């Protein structure tokens, strides 16, 4: 579903885990960690992930930021290369939406500071998604990350 959209400098600086998407991408990919550095108003970074075909891998990335849109470019796989709009941004999480080749009709992505986001964060994420006409129950999550015992 297309949202109804509503970025300070340096807000994506740091380590993030991409644990939730709509539609779900986590049958094709897992364990996505990102590290972003700020370069004035842009970012350059590393993503690491597990791939069924490549195993544990890394990508160099550039975020070229232009108001509320940005263009994500990766070095060696172009399937997630797109303009992304920021839907929500917080201390603990950020949400963006784009239309890469992997998901031409729309891909929403939630990145979190924590590896296993708790109820404190998940309640904010849900309210955030409702303010932009999306709904958390249509998101899939990274069920290969162990976040609970048994
Ligand atoms: C998951 O990602 C981290 C890198 O953030 C890595 O250290 C670890 O090996 C990975 N686990 C699996 C099972 O891929
Ligand atoms: C893309 O960039 C990363 C990080 O610098 C590098 O480790 C990775 O292997 C590159 N991919 C290829 C196919 O060269
Ligand atoms: C996946 O979802 C459930 C709740 O929907 C949560 O308890 C679990 O930790 C989540 N996995 C993540 C975010 O890694």
Author numbering: 1 to 6, 11 to 154
Show the paper's wording.
Diploptera punctata, also known as the Pacific beetle cockroach, is a viviparous cockroach that gives birth to live offspring and secretes a highly concentrated mixture of glycosylated proteins as a source of nourishment for developing embryos. The principal component of this milk is lipocalin-like proteins or Lili-Mips. Lili-Mip has a lipocalin fold and binds to different fatty acids and other moieties. Lili-Mip is small (18.8 kDa), monomeric, and glycosylated.
The intrinsic tryptophan fluorescence change was employed to determine the binding affinity of different fatty acids to Lili-Mip1. Fatty acids of varying chain lengths (14, 16, and 18) and degrees of unsaturation (0, 1, and 2) were assayed. All tested fatty acids bound with micromolar range affinities to the different Lili-Mips. Binding studies with Lili-Mip1 against palmitic acid were performed at different pH values to verify whether the fatty acid binding affinity was pH-dependent. The data showed that Lili-Mip1 had no change in binding affinity for palmitic acid between pH 4.8 and 8.2(KD’s at pH 4.8, 7.2, and 8.2 for Palmitic acid are 1.76± 0.93; 0.44±0.20; 2.24±0.11 μM respectively). Deglycosylated Lili-Mip1 showed a marginal decrease in stability. However, the removal of glycans did not affect the pH-dependent change in the thermal stability of Lili-Mip1. In various crystal structures (reported here and previously by us), Phe-98 and Phe-100 occupy multiple conformations in the binding pocket. Here we show Phe-98 and Phe-100 can reorient to stabilize interactions at the bottom of the cavity–and change the volume of the cavity from 510 Å3 to 337 Å3. The different conformations of Phe-98 and Phe-100 allow Lili-Mips to bind fatty acids of different lengths, thereby explaining the broad substrate tolerance of Lili-Mips.
